[PDB]
Ligand SMILES: [Zn+2]
């Protein structure tokens with residue numbers, strides 16, 4: 001349910017995770033892709 005995880009861009013409405021790293025959670029692919037501008041330089045380590 002949309003309680004266990006919280007979109008780093010929105011809130012508990014989170015439902016979808018980043019493929020690549022499982023350290024952060026989003027709500028939709030839109031937030032995933034929009035965060036990509038910062039996330040692309042971070043995504044890869046994953047700790
Ligand atoms: Zn990632």
Ligand SMILES: [Zn+2]
Nearest residue numbers: 007010027031
């Ligand atoms: Zn979101």
